[PDB]
Amino acid sequence: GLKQKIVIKVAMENCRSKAMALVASTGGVDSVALVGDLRDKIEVVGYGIDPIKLISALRKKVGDAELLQVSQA
Amino acid sequence: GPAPARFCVYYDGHLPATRVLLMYVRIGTTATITARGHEFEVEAKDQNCKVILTNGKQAPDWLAAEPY
């Protein structure tokens, strides 16, 4: 339906690559970019993405992750 | 045998030990990459993951992609 943008800050100090591939492999994702000065944030764009499941998988497999933004932009 | 790649993965650089990871783009979609302070709108066309600007022009030599 509506195009999403989701930004997640992830603690990933290999860890960046892992985090990015997990996000790419999530349902509904069209793109995944590293953003921020420290390249410690992930911007996800797509449709019908479930942010709750996405945050728990990141926390499960990679490290602490928190939602910075969710916008149906 | 493996499924066809679903994404093209873009890098600034061609060498695994030094390249910088930029973005994953779903094959069949277009996305805007930000790199070296500029924007590049790419089309991830297929599993060969040629770097393709949506305006038909030549992309910079340093922009590389491979299938995931």
Residues on chain A touching B25 (C-beta within 8 angstroms): 30-31
The closest of A23, A4, A9, A20 to A73, measured between CA atoms, is A4
C-alpha count within 13 angstroms, C-beta hemisphere, residue B2: 6
| Of A61, A5, A3, A7, the residue nearest A34 (C-alpha) | A7
Q: What is the resolution of this structure in A?
A: 1.9
Domain hosting B18: range is 1-68
Give me the number of domains chain B comprises. 1
Q: Per 3-state DSSP, what percentage of chain A is helix, strand, and coil (rounded to 5)?
A: 30, 40, 30
Q: Among B19, B26, B28, B32, which residue's Cα sits nearest to residue B64? A: B19
Structural domains in chain A plus CATH codes: 1-73 (3.30.70.100)
Amino acid at A8: I
Does B26 sit within 8 Å of A46, measured CB to CB?
Answer: yes
Report the Cα A20 to chain-centroid distance in Å.
7
Q: Do A34 and B29 touch (CB under 8 A)?
A: no
Residue-wise burial string across A48-72, b where 16 or more C-beta atoms lie within 10 A, e elsewhere: ebeeeebbebbeeebeebeeeeeee
CA distance B3 to B18: 29
Four-CA torsion A64, A66, A72, B4, nearest 10 degrees: -10
Which of chain B's residues have a Cβ under 8 Å away from the Cβ of A24? 7, 9, 24, 68
